[PDB]
Short mmCIF file of C-alpha atoms and ligand atoms in Angstrom, two decimals:
data_model
loop_
_atom_site.label_atom_id
_atom_site.label_comp_id
_atom_site.label_asym_id
_atom_site.label_seq_id
_atom_site.Cartn_x
_atom_site.Cartn_y
_atom_site.Cartn_z
CA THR U 27 -0.01 -0.25 -0.35
CA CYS U 28 1.47 3.57 -0.28
CA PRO U 29 3.02 4.65 2.58
CA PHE U 30 2.75 7.48 4.76
CA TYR U 31 5.64 9.72 3.29
CA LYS U 32 4.86 9.74 0.18
CA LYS U 33 1.46 11.65 1.21
CA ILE U 34 1.00 14.90 2.20
CA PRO U 35 -1.77 16.42 4.31
CA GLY U 36 -5.37 18.03 4.35
CA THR U 37 -5.02 17.83 0.39
CA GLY U 38 -5.85 14.63 -1.99
CA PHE U 39 -1.56 14.90 -3.54
CA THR U 40 0.31 11.81 -3.33
CA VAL U 41 4.98 12.78 -4.40
CA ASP U 42 6.78 9.79 -6.35
CA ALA U 43 3.63 7.43 -5.56
CA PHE U 44 3.31 5.57 -9.73
CA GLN U 45 3.36 2.12 -8.29
CA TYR U 46 0.85 1.51 -6.38
CA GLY U 47 -2.18 1.54 -8.54
CA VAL U 48 -5.20 4.39 -7.90
CA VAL U 49 -3.86 5.74 -4.60
CA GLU U 50 -7.58 6.04 -2.86
CA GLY U 51 -8.65 10.43 -2.49
CA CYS U 52 -5.72 11.21 -5.08
CA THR U 53 -6.47 13.78 -6.85
CA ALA U 54 -3.06 15.24 -8.05
CA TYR U 55 0.61 12.81 -8.23
CA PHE U 56 3.66 14.92 -8.13
CA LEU U 57 6.65 13.70 -9.84
CA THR U 58 9.95 15.12 -8.74
CA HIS U 59 13.10 13.89 -11.10
CA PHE U 60 13.06 10.98 -13.38
CA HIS U 61 14.28 8.18 -11.72
CA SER U 62 12.75 4.57 -12.22
CA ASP U 63 12.70 4.41 -8.61
CA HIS U 64 10.48 7.52 -8.07
CA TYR U 65 8.40 7.13 -11.96
CA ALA U 66 7.79 3.03 -11.07
CA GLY U 67 4.68 2.60 -13.03
CA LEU U 68 4.07 5.23 -15.73
CA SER U 69 3.20 4.58 -18.89
CA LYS U 70 0.55 5.74 -22.18
CA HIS U 71 -1.96 3.94 -20.02
CA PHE U 72 -2.08 6.39 -16.74
CA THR U 73 -5.25 8.90 -17.12
CA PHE U 74 -4.55 10.50 -14.29
CA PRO U 75 -3.07 14.38 -14.17
CA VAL U 76 0.42 14.32 -13.24
CA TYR U 77 2.63 17.22 -12.85
CA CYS U 78 6.09 18.24 -13.33
CA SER U 79 9.04 20.05 -14.61
CA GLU U 80 8.96 20.54 -17.92
CA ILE U 81 12.32 18.65 -18.51
CA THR U 82 10.57 16.26 -16.33
CA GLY U 83 7.71 16.50 -18.88
CA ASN U 84 9.65 15.68 -22.01
CA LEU U 85 10.87 12.53 -20.92
CA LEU U 86 7.47 11.44 -19.94
CA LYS U 87 6.42 12.01 -22.94
CA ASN U 88 9.48 11.12 -25.37
CA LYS U 89 10.52 7.83 -23.26
CA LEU U 90 7.31 7.27 -21.22
CA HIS U 91 5.12 7.85 -24.25
CA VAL U 92 2.45 9.18 -21.43
CA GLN U 93 -0.52 11.40 -23.11
CA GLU U 94 0.23 15.07 -23.39
CA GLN U 95 -3.28 15.04 -22.13
CA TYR U 96 -1.39 14.27 -18.40
CA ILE U 97 1.06 16.30 -18.40
CA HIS U 98 1.04 19.56 -16.36
CA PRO U 99 4.46 20.66 -16.33
CA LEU U 100 5.65 23.78 -14.35
CA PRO U 101 8.21 26.34 -14.19
CA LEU U 102 9.99 26.78 -11.67
CA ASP U 103 10.28 29.93 -8.99
CA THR U 104 6.51 30.56 -9.26
CA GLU U 105 3.89 30.32 -7.29
CA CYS U 106 1.15 27.76 -9.03
CA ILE U 107 -2.71 27.27 -8.31
CA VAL U 108 -3.17 23.27 -8.00
CA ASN U 109 -6.39 21.61 -7.13
CA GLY U 110 -7.06 25.15 -5.13
CA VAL U 111 -3.59 24.81 -3.40
CA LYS U 112 -0.97 27.23 -3.69
CA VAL U 113 2.35 24.94 -4.73
CA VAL U 114 5.88 25.91 -6.29
CA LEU U 115 8.63 24.12 -7.98
CA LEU U 116 12.16 24.65 -6.66
CA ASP U 117 15.92 23.33 -8.27
CA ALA U 118 16.40 20.90 -6.14
CA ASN U 119 20.34 20.67 -7.19
CA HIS U 120 19.94 16.47 -8.46
CA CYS U 121 19.44 15.55 -12.28
CA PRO U 122 18.34 17.12 -15.58
CA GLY U 123 14.65 18.91 -14.17
CA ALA U 124 14.31 17.77 -10.29
CA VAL U 125 12.20 19.73 -8.44
CA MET U 126 11.71 20.73 -4.30
CA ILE U 127 8.41 21.40 -3.87
CA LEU U 128 6.39 23.83 -1.56
CA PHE U 129 2.63 23.16 -0.87
CA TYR U 130 0.94 26.16 0.63
CA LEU U 131 -1.88 24.91 3.25
CA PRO U 132 -5.44 26.24 2.89
CA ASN U 133 -5.13 26.01 6.82
CA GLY U 134 -1.75 27.87 7.36
CA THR U 135 -0.09 24.76 6.93
CA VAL U 136 3.58 24.81 5.01
CA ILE U 137 5.29 21.62 3.64
CA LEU U 138 8.90 21.13 2.40
CA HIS U 139 9.83 17.87 -0.05
CA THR U 140 12.76 17.81 -1.49
CA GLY U 141 12.12 15.17 -3.71
CA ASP U 142 15.90 14.13 -3.98
CA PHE U 143 18.30 16.71 -3.40
CA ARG U 144 22.11 18.46 -2.86
CA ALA U 145 21.99 20.72 -0.78
CA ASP U 146 23.46 23.86 -1.48
CA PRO U 147 23.68 27.48 0.48
CA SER U 148 22.02 29.11 -2.70
CA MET U 149 18.87 27.39 -1.43
CA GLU U 150 19.10 29.59 1.66
CA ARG U 151 18.23 32.66 -1.52
CA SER U 152 14.81 30.60 -2.76
CA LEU U 153 11.33 31.59 -2.18
CA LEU U 154 12.85 29.62 0.88
CA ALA U 155 13.81 32.35 2.37
CA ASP U 156 10.86 34.41 2.77
CA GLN U 157 8.52 32.25 4.39
CA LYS U 158 8.06 29.94 7.86
CA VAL U 159 7.95 25.82 6.52
CA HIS U 160 6.15 23.78 9.56
CA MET U 161 6.62 19.92 7.78
CA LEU U 162 10.23 19.02 5.95
CA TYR U 163 10.08 14.91 4.44
CA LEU U 164 13.59 14.69 3.81
CA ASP U 165 16.17 13.74 1.28
CA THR U 166 18.34 11.35 3.76
CA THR U 167 19.80 9.28 1.43
CA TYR U 168 23.63 10.06 3.19
CA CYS U 169 22.58 10.70 6.85
CA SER U 170 25.49 9.49 8.61
CA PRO U 171 27.76 11.90 9.59
CA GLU U 172 31.02 8.28 7.93
CA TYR U 173 29.30 10.02 4.68
CA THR U 174 31.90 13.40 2.91
CA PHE U 175 32.64 13.66 -0.25
CA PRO U 176 33.89 16.93 -2.23
CA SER U 177 32.52 19.92 -4.48
CA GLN U 178 31.23 18.46 -7.69
CA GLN U 179 34.28 21.20 -9.00
CA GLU U 180 37.03 19.26 -7.60
CA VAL U 181 35.81 16.22 -9.50
CA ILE U 182 35.19 17.74 -12.69
CA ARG U 183 39.12 19.11 -12.34
CA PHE U 184 40.16 16.06 -11.46
CA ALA U 185 38.59 14.50 -14.09
CA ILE U 186 39.29 16.57 -16.84
CA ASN U 187 43.29 16.67 -16.21
CA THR U 188 43.34 13.30 -15.61
CA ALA U 189 41.93 12.66 -19.42
CA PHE U 190 43.94 15.36 -20.64
CA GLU U 191 46.94 13.81 -20.24
CA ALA U 192 46.37 10.69 -20.75
CA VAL U 193 45.52 11.50 -24.06
CA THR U 194 47.88 13.79 -24.67
CA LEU U 195 50.37 11.05 -23.73
CA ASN U 196 48.71 8.88 -26.42
CA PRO U 197 46.50 10.04 -29.35
CA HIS U 198 44.75 6.30 -28.86
CA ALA U 199 43.51 6.30 -25.87
CA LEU U 200 39.72 5.83 -25.64
CA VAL U 201 38.00 7.28 -23.05
CA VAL U 202 35.05 5.81 -21.80
CA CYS U 203 32.00 6.71 -19.41
CA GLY U 204 28.98 4.53 -17.90
CA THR U 205 25.93 5.71 -17.03
CA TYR U 206 22.58 4.07 -16.06
CA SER U 207 19.76 6.56 -15.50
CA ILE U 208 19.72 10.71 -16.42
CA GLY U 209 22.46 12.91 -14.05
CA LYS U 210 25.96 12.89 -14.15
CA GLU U 211 26.39 14.48 -17.56
CA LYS U 212 29.00 17.42 -16.50
CA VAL U 213 31.58 14.32 -15.90
CA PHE U 214 31.21 13.23 -19.66
CA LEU U 215 30.12 17.01 -21.05
CA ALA U 216 33.42 18.32 -19.71
CA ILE U 217 35.84 15.63 -20.82
CA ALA U 218 34.80 15.07 -24.19
CA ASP U 219 34.92 19.37 -24.31
CA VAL U 220 38.87 19.42 -23.04
CA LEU U 221 39.55 16.64 -25.52
CA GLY U 222 37.52 18.36 -29.00
CA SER U 223 35.03 15.33 -29.40
CA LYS U 224 31.44 14.70 -29.31
CA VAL U 225 30.02 12.54 -26.90
CA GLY U 226 29.66 9.48 -28.48
CA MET U 227 26.41 7.31 -27.15
CA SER U 228 23.77 4.83 -28.27
CA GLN U 229 20.82 5.85 -30.77
CA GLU U 230 18.30 5.52 -26.86
CA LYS U 231 20.22 7.41 -24.83
CA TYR U 232 21.12 10.58 -27.65
CA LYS U 233 17.05 10.89 -26.68
CA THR U 234 17.14 10.62 -23.88
CA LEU U 235 19.55 13.43 -23.44
CA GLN U 236 17.98 15.08 -26.16
CA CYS U 237 14.40 16.17 -23.70
CA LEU U 238 16.86 17.96 -20.98
CA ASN U 239 17.60 21.13 -23.08
CA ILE U 240 20.91 21.34 -22.04
CA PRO U 241 22.54 24.68 -24.49
CA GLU U 242 24.59 23.81 -27.44
CA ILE U 243 23.69 19.58 -27.21
CA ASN U 244 23.71 19.20 -31.09
CA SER U 245 27.88 21.10 -30.85
CA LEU U 246 28.34 18.39 -28.11
CA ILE U 247 26.80 14.71 -28.51
CA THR U 248 26.24 12.36 -30.88
CA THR U 249 25.83 8.80 -32.81
CA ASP U 250 28.08 8.60 -34.71
CA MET U 251 30.92 6.42 -32.55
CA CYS U 252 33.54 6.56 -35.13
CA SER U 253 33.94 9.73 -35.26
CA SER U 254 34.29 10.20 -31.15
CA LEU U 255 37.14 9.57 -28.55
CA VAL U 256 34.27 9.12 -25.51
CA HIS U 257 31.91 6.84 -26.17
CA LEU U 258 29.27 6.20 -23.18
CA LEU U 259 28.22 2.85 -22.13
CA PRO U 260 26.43 1.24 -19.22
CA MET U 261 26.82 1.26 -16.40
CA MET U 262 27.17 -2.88 -16.03
CA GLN U 263 30.20 -2.49 -19.10
CA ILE U 264 32.00 -0.72 -17.19
CA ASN U 265 34.53 -3.92 -16.35
CA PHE U 266 37.48 -6.08 -17.75
CA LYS U 267 35.47 -7.91 -19.20
CA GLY U 268 33.41 -5.94 -21.05
CA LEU U 269 36.14 -3.16 -22.03
CA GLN U 270 38.27 -5.51 -23.78
CA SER U 271 35.17 -6.34 -25.53
CA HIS U 272 34.16 -3.08 -26.76
CA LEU U 273 38.11 -2.14 -27.77
CA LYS U 274 37.99 -5.07 -30.12
CA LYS U 275 34.64 -3.63 -31.63
CA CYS U 276 36.70 -0.13 -32.64
CA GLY U 277 39.00 -1.94 -34.74
CA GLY U 278 42.29 -1.24 -33.85
CA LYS U 279 41.33 3.05 -34.42
CA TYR U 280 42.44 2.67 -29.94
CA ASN U 281 44.96 0.48 -28.40
CA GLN U 282 44.78 1.47 -24.67
CA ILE U 283 41.33 2.31 -22.43
CA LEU U 284 41.06 5.15 -19.72
CA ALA U 285 37.35 4.59 -17.75
CA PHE U 286 35.61 6.51 -15.70
CA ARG U 287 32.61 4.88 -13.66
CA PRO U 288 30.82 8.21 -11.15
CA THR U 289 29.46 6.44 -7.26
CA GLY U 290 28.16 8.06 -4.63
CA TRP U 291 30.06 7.19 -1.54
CA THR U 292 32.66 4.52 -2.00
CA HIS U 293 34.77 3.95 1.91
CA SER U 294 37.69 4.67 0.37
CA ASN U 295 35.98 8.69 1.44
CA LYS U 296 36.75 8.18 4.87
CA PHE U 297 40.99 7.50 3.61
CA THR U 298 41.39 8.64 0.95
CA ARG U 299 41.67 12.23 -0.57
CA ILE U 300 40.57 13.90 -4.51
CA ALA U 301 44.19 14.29 -5.29
CA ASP U 302 44.94 10.61 -4.05
CA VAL U 303 42.64 8.37 -6.13
CA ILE U 304 44.11 6.12 -8.44
CA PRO U 305 42.50 3.02 -11.32
CA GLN U 306 42.61 0.08 -11.12
CA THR U 307 44.22 -0.97 -14.18
CA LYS U 308 44.76 -4.27 -15.75
CA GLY U 309 46.71 -4.29 -19.51
CA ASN U 310 45.82 -1.25 -21.36
CA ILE U 311 42.87 -0.70 -19.45
CA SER U 312 42.31 1.35 -16.45
CA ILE U 313 38.97 2.69 -14.09
CA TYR U 314 38.52 5.07 -12.30
CA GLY U 315 35.70 5.31 -9.40
CA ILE U 316 35.29 9.16 -8.60
CA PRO U 317 32.51 10.20 -5.98
CA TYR U 318 30.65 12.89 -8.13
CA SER U 319 27.08 12.23 -6.09
CA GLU U 320 23.79 14.19 -6.81
CA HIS U 321 22.87 13.70 -3.20
CA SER U 322 23.86 15.76 0.00
CA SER U 323 26.69 15.08 1.87
CA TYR U 324 26.05 14.64 5.79
CA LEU U 325 27.33 18.40 6.85
CA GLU U 326 25.53 19.81 2.84
CA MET U 327 21.66 18.69 5.27
CA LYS U 328 22.27 19.44 8.53
CA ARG U 329 23.02 22.98 7.38
CA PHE U 330 20.12 22.92 5.03
CA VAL U 331 17.45 21.75 8.09
CA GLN U 332 19.56 24.25 10.77
CA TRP U 333 18.82 26.75 8.20
CA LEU U 334 16.02 25.85 7.71
CA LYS U 335 14.61 25.48 11.68
CA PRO U 336 11.61 23.20 10.85
CA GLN U 337 8.59 21.53 13.54
CA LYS U 338 8.73 18.13 12.26
CA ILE U 339 11.44 15.76 9.52
CA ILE U 340 10.27 13.23 7.84
CA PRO U 341 13.39 11.02 6.42
CA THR U 342 12.24 9.65 2.40
CA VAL U 343 15.18 7.79 2.51
CA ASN U 344 16.49 4.36 4.60
CA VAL U 345 12.84 4.18 6.52
CA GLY U 346 12.88 0.48 5.83
CA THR U 347 15.03 -0.60 9.27
CA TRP U 348 14.03 0.05 13.14
CA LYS U 349 18.23 0.93 13.18
CA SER U 350 18.16 3.05 10.46
CA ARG U 351 15.65 5.08 11.22
CA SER U 352 16.11 5.14 14.97
CA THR U 353 20.02 6.69 14.12
CA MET U 354 18.61 9.01 11.35
CA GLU U 355 16.07 10.23 14.66
CA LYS U 356 19.03 11.66 16.59
CA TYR U 357 20.84 13.04 14.38
CA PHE U 358 17.70 14.66 13.75
CA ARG U 359 17.59 15.94 17.57
CA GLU U 360 22.04 17.19 17.90
CA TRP U 361 20.85 19.42 15.01
CA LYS U 362 17.78 20.86 16.60
CA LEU U 363 20.10 21.14 20.33
CA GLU U 364 22.60 22.66 18.98
CA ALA U 365 21.07 25.19 16.32
CA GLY U 366 18.61 25.89 19.70
CA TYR U 367 15.37 25.65 17.32
NI1 NI Q 8 17.32 10.12 -7.83
#
């Protein structure tokens, strides 16, 4: 059945609740972003109103074939009325088209649902600064102090310099980058830009990227693999077996692969600095795991919440075990006592 943390009190609304069949009493289904654990259940046969960003609405239409009449895209940073309730969509700093949603309940309560987010100080100067929030439905993916990671900028710097050095040393090296969903486009696009190459990919993946309103995208990507020295492949193929195989397909155009796996967190982060990251190498193939996150670190999440000072927090991630739930609630209380709200 639909869990309580996907329901917005005092409304007929749900968030990211498409796999439960018809939710009893739901008048509008919100979708925060186009990732499969969140859209699971949508298709051309869906006949209820879906509210989302413009980019998420491009993907619903083009990838899932949802009929246009049921897609209700909303502009960001704009007060809108949905079934008599005022809402605003904010940028979530997650993947393309990902939003947070602010609901202004008729009784005066204000609720923020973060969807999936990477908290940032820039959020402290959006429409959130302008009124008090009573309840926060919080992306708690990495809500434990062991989860530290570098800025996105530092990670992209590392990847750009690594790729540039390798290819200038060996002009016959191929760069490969793994992907399994939208998000993290900066990794492969920044590498292609420093090398003066387009990124080559499957027709399915080119179609997905063409829905994202990225500027000058026709200049950066292509389906002609032959003309490209940055290839994108499914994340599952980013291993020695899958990479040797791909190298065989390139017809002796290349004699070395340098591959990037943009993971979330990995426990090399407790010890290792970004400066100190090394590949796993087998023969003429090297694989780098880089900690490019599109979710809040523990410290980034803590700062956002101590700034917002919500009256009640409802976690949306890691809610399936009592030890996780209990540990999260302990951090919430610490933050509150330290900050004084
Ligand atoms: Ni996500």
